[PDB]
Design a protein around this nucleic acid. Structure first.
Ligand SMILES: Nc1ccn([C@H]2C[C@H](O)[C@@H](COP(=O)(O)OP(=O)(O)OP(=O)(O)O)O2)c(=O)n1
Ligand SMILES: [Mg+2]
Ligand SMILES: [Mg+2]
Length: 428
DNA sequence: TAAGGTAGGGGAGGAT
DNA sequence: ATCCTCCCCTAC
């Protein structure tokens, strides 16, 4: 018990073993890799000439579901269908990694703090908190992916995440529903109690929206020609791929707070969109509202091997960072470079460009954040350098990293987050 | 207390 | 116009 501090040689090890966000990233990176290894010898790209159907498959409230099926006996009293359940580490300003649909019926969301969530529960409803079961999340993911390959349904299976895949059926020149039902059934069995939803369409965007609409353990079909106002009206603006908190806020400020995608599509003009959120994004939203994919989004189908090929490598620590002097910082940077170099050498690459980025306590922010050991409100400072020659040498890299830190001049006591990045990777 | 990581599109504004 | 650095955003 008692958390390993940031000045301890195995801080990274212990922090990563506990951080679900690090797991998410690590699992994602490994899956991309596995895809590249399994397809070294397989013609893989899809063309303009090709006709295809997208089946976007995702586990429902993934950690919550798995953590519940694997729960210790002191929680046997729990009922997934009637009780609000979440997976998290703590009791107050702790992230709810995943919450079940009963919890969502009260307004609880993934990403919300436990303290926030409990305020949303009416008298007589108690929040149930489950621990993370990382190894089990991984075993269910493996079953999911092997099961997909085993049915011999798809021409290609793109791993998006530990619980999500974009599967493609190429159609040469009703069945879809039977297929959706088979996949859901076999995955439910190959996984034991887990559930998966499916969005099926002729565009990646619609498949993703259909997925959201199908979500509570089901499937939804919807093609470009099935679009209706009832379909639009059912989505929040940030249900669009590529639209998060800021884009939402900008869309709202520009088009008189539209509440559903239908309201947005009835009010927008391409030009205003572009002025509001960027053009490409504006352009992406524009196409999405007509059920069409932007070119950027399509590269993953026309060339998965290049899209899935890792182009950078880094660590980003923003919790538990508390230092008193530059010596501790230097040692931390050194260890960070040692960790990254282990990774770099594992994927047989060198780097020609590095970046040190840091989070510094804002002038106006409290010295200790509302969140225990959190970074709190901070300002970003970043600096990069081109290395003369691609290298994997600790000496060159660590020395430049330490040098970049002096240039940004953040007093150690103000440091609250730190990122070490290898931006351009060169081969062999 | 509680584990706020990371890859990789993008755009602003200064350098060419 | 294009390219580069230092961010911001989103995704999961
Ligand atoms: N802010 C977040 C979002 C997600 N995740 C983890 C928890 C989830 O189980 C998993 C999957 O992301 P999803 O968006 O797919 O979350 P769910 O699968 O839990 O919800 P849904 O049923 O809406 O797909 O990754 C997390 O730790 N923190
Ligand atoms: Mg999911
Ligand atoms: Mg997912």
């Amino acid at each position: 018990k008692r958390i390993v501090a940031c000045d301890d040689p195995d801080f990274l090890t212990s922090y990563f073993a506990h951080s679900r966000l690090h797991h998410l990233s690590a699992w994602k990176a490994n899956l991309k890799d596995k895809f590249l290894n399994e397809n070294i010898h397989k013609y893989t790209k899809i063309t303009d000439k090709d006709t295809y159907i997208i089946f976007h498959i995702d586990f429902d409230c993934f950690f919550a579901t798995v953590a519940y099926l694997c729960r210790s006996s002191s929680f046997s009293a729990c009922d997934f269908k009637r009780d609000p359940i979440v997976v998290c580490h703590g009791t107050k300003n702790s992230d709810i990694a995943s919450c079940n649909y009963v919890a969502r019926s009260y307004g609880i969301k993934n990403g919300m703090w436990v303290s926030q969530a409990e305020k949303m529960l009416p008298n007589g409803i108690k929040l149930i908190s489950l621990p993370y079961t990382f190894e089990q999340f991984q075993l269910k993911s493996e079953a999911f992916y092997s099961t997909l390959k085993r049915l011999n349904i798809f021409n290609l299976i793109l791993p998006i995440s530990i619980d999500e895949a974009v599967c493609v059926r190429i159609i040469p020149d009703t069945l879809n529903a039977r297929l959706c039902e088979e996949i859901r059934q076999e995955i439910f069995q190959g996984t034991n109690g887990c559930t998966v939803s499916i969005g099926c369409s002729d565009s990646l965007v619609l498949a993703r929206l259909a997925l959201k609409m199908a979500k509570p353990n089901g499937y939804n079909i919807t093609f470009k020609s099935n679009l209706s106002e009832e379909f639009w009206s059912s989505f929040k603006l940030d249900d669009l791929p590529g639209v998060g908190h800021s884009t939402l806020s900008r869309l709202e400020s520009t088009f008189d707070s539209p509440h559903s995608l239908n309201d947005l599509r009835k009010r927008y003009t391409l030009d205003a969109l572009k002025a509001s959120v960027g053009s490409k994004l504006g352009m992406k939203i524009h196409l999405a509202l007509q059920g069409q994919d932007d070119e950027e989004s399509l590269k993953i189908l026309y060339d998965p091997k290049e899209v899935l090929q890792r182009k950078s490598l880094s660590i980003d620590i923003n919790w538990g960072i508390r230092f008193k002097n530059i010596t501790q910082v230097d040692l931390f940077i050194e260890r960070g470079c040692q960790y990254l170099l282990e990774k770099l050498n594992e994927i047989n690459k060198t780097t020609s460009q590095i970046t040190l980025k840091l989070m510094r306590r804002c002038k106006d922010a409290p010295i200790e954040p509302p969140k225990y050991m959190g970074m709190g409100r901070c300002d970003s400072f970043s600096r990069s350098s081109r290395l003369g020659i691609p290298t994997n040498e600790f000496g060159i890299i660590a020395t430049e990293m330490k040098s970049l830190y002096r240039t940004l001049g953040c007093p150690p006591m103000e440091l609250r987050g730190l990122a070490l990045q290898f931006n351009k990777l060169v081969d062999v």
